[PDB]
Q: What sequence folds into this?
RNA sequence: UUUUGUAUAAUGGGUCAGCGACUUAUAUUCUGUAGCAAGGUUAACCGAAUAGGGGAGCCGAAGGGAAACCGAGUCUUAACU
RNA sequence: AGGACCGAACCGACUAAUGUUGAAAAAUUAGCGGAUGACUUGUGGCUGGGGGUGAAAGGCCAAUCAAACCGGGAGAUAGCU
RNA sequence: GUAACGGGGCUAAACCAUGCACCGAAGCUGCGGCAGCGACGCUUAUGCGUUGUUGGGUAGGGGAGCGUUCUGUAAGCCUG
RNA sequence: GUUUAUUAAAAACACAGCACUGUGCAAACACGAAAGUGGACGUAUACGGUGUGACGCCUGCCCGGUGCCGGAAGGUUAAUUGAUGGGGUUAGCGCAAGCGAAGCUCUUGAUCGAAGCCCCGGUAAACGGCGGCCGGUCCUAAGGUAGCGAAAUUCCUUGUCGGGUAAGUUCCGACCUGCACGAAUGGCGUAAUGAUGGCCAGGCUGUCUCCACCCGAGACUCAGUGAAAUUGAACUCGCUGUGAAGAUGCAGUGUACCCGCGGCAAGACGGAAAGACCCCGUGAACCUUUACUAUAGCUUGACACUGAACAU
RNA sequence: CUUUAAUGUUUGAUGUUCUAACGUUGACCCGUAAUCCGGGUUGCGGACAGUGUCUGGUGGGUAGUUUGACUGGGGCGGUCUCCUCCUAAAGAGUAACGGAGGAGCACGAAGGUUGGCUAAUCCUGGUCGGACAUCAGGAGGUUAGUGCAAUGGCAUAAGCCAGCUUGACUGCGAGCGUGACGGCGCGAGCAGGUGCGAAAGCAGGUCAUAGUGAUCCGGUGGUUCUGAAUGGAAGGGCCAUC
């Protein structure tokens, strides 16, 4: 319902992104997580986008 | 007001005491841990009990609470 | 394919892939066909003369299938590793 | 006259070596965030048409 | 005939005689049979014409992959036990 | 004088009986309305089918009318008998 | 219209219990015949002194045949 | 007067009268790809459309909604036009990632751009609408006026009271708690007219109590000619049961010598018409509309046919 | 090159005038002893009207159609996909317009891991204190809790608290279960890289089971796989995703 779809984009420039959801109303701060980037095969910071 | 039901889930003991099992075969499907896991038996995320080794299924009752355990005995 | 109004299998599954125009002009040559050619030399034009491949084939590749028991010269055709070994085991040659 | 191929099936199926038909899986086109990565990874490869559907596919693809 | 079910008060037929309904064409798959066999076979066409020529083509002897491509392997994957 | 009155011809058709494999695919008998008018009638002509005509009832358009008849698409289609 | 034993009739020819007998089917056995499916020994393009067994049937599936007209066989054969 | 030729003749249609509305004449409108024709060889005292329907008294209030009419500051808005931006290509420069003129090219879509719709006013004999609350007040566009009313309209209802009858669900008169009258989809009356609906009375009667007799045409017999529907086959009874559930045909039982003729209609689920009612089929056809998608017609604008001067 | 005055000059506009396009169902002449038609002269209109293409609005005037099924007939009412229980006859499964309830989410912590902990209720005593606020002890032993229905589970806790964290990872997957199928589900284990823990190890989201929508068309990111003479590019494919 309220909880809207976003993508978390790699910070390695590979164009890889994960996709998730976020409640924008509560906790509006941008999401940031160490996720595995398979293009570079390293754990890298992924930042909220879209 | 009462014309509703859910698709039956086909839960239950899929493999009975003493039968031979290959590794990975589901023994019992269950809501909650009605059967607990013992030797060479793994518990799944939805509490499914499956064989972690090739063997024969064995049922037992163990522990202070008289709980039922599924074990696989290597043949 | 009618299933009584249920969405049939072909409309229920997705489309995939594309058709390559390179494939229609590519062809495969078995080792048995290397001795059917006339003159002992192997090439597109002589294979077309011997009726091993169609007139419109522009690319060919010899593969390990059958046996070659005579010296054979190959030119302008790809050859697999096994077919290359088989040709060279019978006193042949391969040229690019 | 020649039998006419069903072109949707001609786009959906390909014949294999032993006579079966391969196809791409359904449910991997557009509501992908909620689906588990395990499910999509298992859907990605191709699959063989089943016995119940082989007759329909063969009727649709006479010249395959 | 149709039905779960018809002596049925369910349909059909007044009787006889004549006619009256799964065919033909082309494709394709399977079975039998015959010829040839890693080969099989021609179409149109020519032809003093059911001969003979015509192998243009078609199927088969190699598959995998969306594809390039590789090839008794190939695809998937950075790579597969 | 009168879309006046009674009433034959003429034009109609309110009631009843008959008849309903009829004398007749709409009539006969007895009664009944109009009967110088928006009357009636002969001869010829015009309006044609999604059209005509209609003091209007979906009425009439060759015994056929909520879309004539003939021929064609046509062996329409019929998951029904 | 008797019309609540099928009827006649029945004090048992009714009910209970116990016995021995009989009737009773297209069931079973007897004798004769046909066909199929097998297994058998002599044997061989097989059938049989054999042997066991099977043989109701709609929709439907499979197997084998009869008969009609026409073509060759056939200017043959039959026929005033 | 007209009307469903062939089950409806009427309260239905028409009508004289009245009102609204359109129409200035190459009229509106209609038939027509068009030419042309009717309207009309007429000209607003005319012609078309629409509604009501002699005549008498009349015809109340509402322009909020839909429609039509008129006017407009402004908003949005098509075709057409194409400012700016982005991308492809390659001249060139590049010890090169790459950049990248001009031309052609794909894409964006600044600006101009009419009616329409939004908005304001009129119009009800346009479509239509016409209250509650407590013994002043809310709401509305306004709150049913005149007249009529158990009515062709009143469910309860055979409303109540009266008239007429011995007895009156009908009729007549009055009443008013009008389920659910009402003023040109007209309201209320109205002399005359009516093969019009309802009620009552005199006369008359075989309508009836309750049928009798008679005269003719059939029916019946004789001679002549000579159909039809229907029909699986019949050696074609009653009853009780049974049974695809209502039996000439089954079971049990009773009765019954064989065959005609005149009659009657209780059965042969009698004959006639593949039920019209009901349901169904992703059936058909007609009609409606603010269902959908279209379209003729009408209307707006741009370009063409299509030009010259002049002033701002 | 910044800015700013004018016209011959190019189209934009309003207006007025004009005539030669175009109209005349005005008059007179002729073809012609002819209310047609045409030509001509003249008047009246006049770049308007009107016609062609394109365009916005209107448009039951006309046309083609659609308007579901289930259903103790049909209609009106209800329902239609998913989850829990019961009917359901002690494996699975099992119908009715049978009996009862829920879902169409939520959470970057409410996930992972390490360490720690243990409830409801009542009894008694105690400042404001009431039958029920916090504190102290006692009985009690899950009569609590679980993000949301129900069932089944949970003390090794799956319930509560805190520290560090992103395994709500990527490729695969022996083997199973459940489906007519499309599919759905569980899964040890291998490779890569990572979090927590001294370590053994745990982690491929959450106590489990509802929280969902095939295909086609198309949009975005990546990928030189393809690229219709050649090099590009468009378009298409593959991967992620709306």
A:
């Amino acid at each position: 319902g309220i909880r809207e779809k976003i993508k978390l984009v790699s910070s390695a420039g590979t164009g890889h992104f994960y996709t998730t959801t976020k409640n924008k109303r509560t906790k509006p701060e941008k999401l940031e997580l160490k996720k595995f980037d398979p293009v570079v095969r390293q754990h890298v910071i992924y930042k909220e986008a879209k | 007001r009462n014309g509703r039901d859910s698709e039956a889930k086909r839960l239950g003991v899929k493999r009975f005491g003493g039968e031979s099992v290959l590794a990975g075969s589901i023994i019992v499907r269950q809501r909650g841990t009605k059967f607990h896991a013992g030797a060479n038996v793994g518990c799944g995320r939805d509490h499914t009990l499956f064989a972690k080794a090739d063997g024969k299924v064995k049922f037992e009752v163990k522990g202070p609470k008289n709980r039922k355990f599924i074990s696989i005995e290597a043949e | 394919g009618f299933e009584g109004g249920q969405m049939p299998l072909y409309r229920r599954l997705p489309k995939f892939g594309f058709t390559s125009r390179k494939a229609a002009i590519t062809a495969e040559i078995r080792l048995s066909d290397l001795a059917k050619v006339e003159g002992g030399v192997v090439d597109l034009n002589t294979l077309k003369a011997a009726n091993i491949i169609g007139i419109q084939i522009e690319f060919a590749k010899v593969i390990l299938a059958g046996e070659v028991t005579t010296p054979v010269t190959v030119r302008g055709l790809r050859v697999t590793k096994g077919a290359r070994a088989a040709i060279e085991a019978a006193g042949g040659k391969i040229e690019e | 006259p020649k039998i006419k191929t069903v072109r949707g099936a001609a786009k959906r199926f390909k014949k294999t070596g032993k006579g079966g038909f391969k196809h791409k899986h359904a449910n991997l086109r557009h509501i992908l965030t909620k689906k588990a990565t395990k499910r999509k990874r298992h859907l990605r490869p191709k699959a063989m048409v089943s016995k119940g559907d082989l007759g329909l596919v063969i009727a649709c693809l006479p010249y395959a």
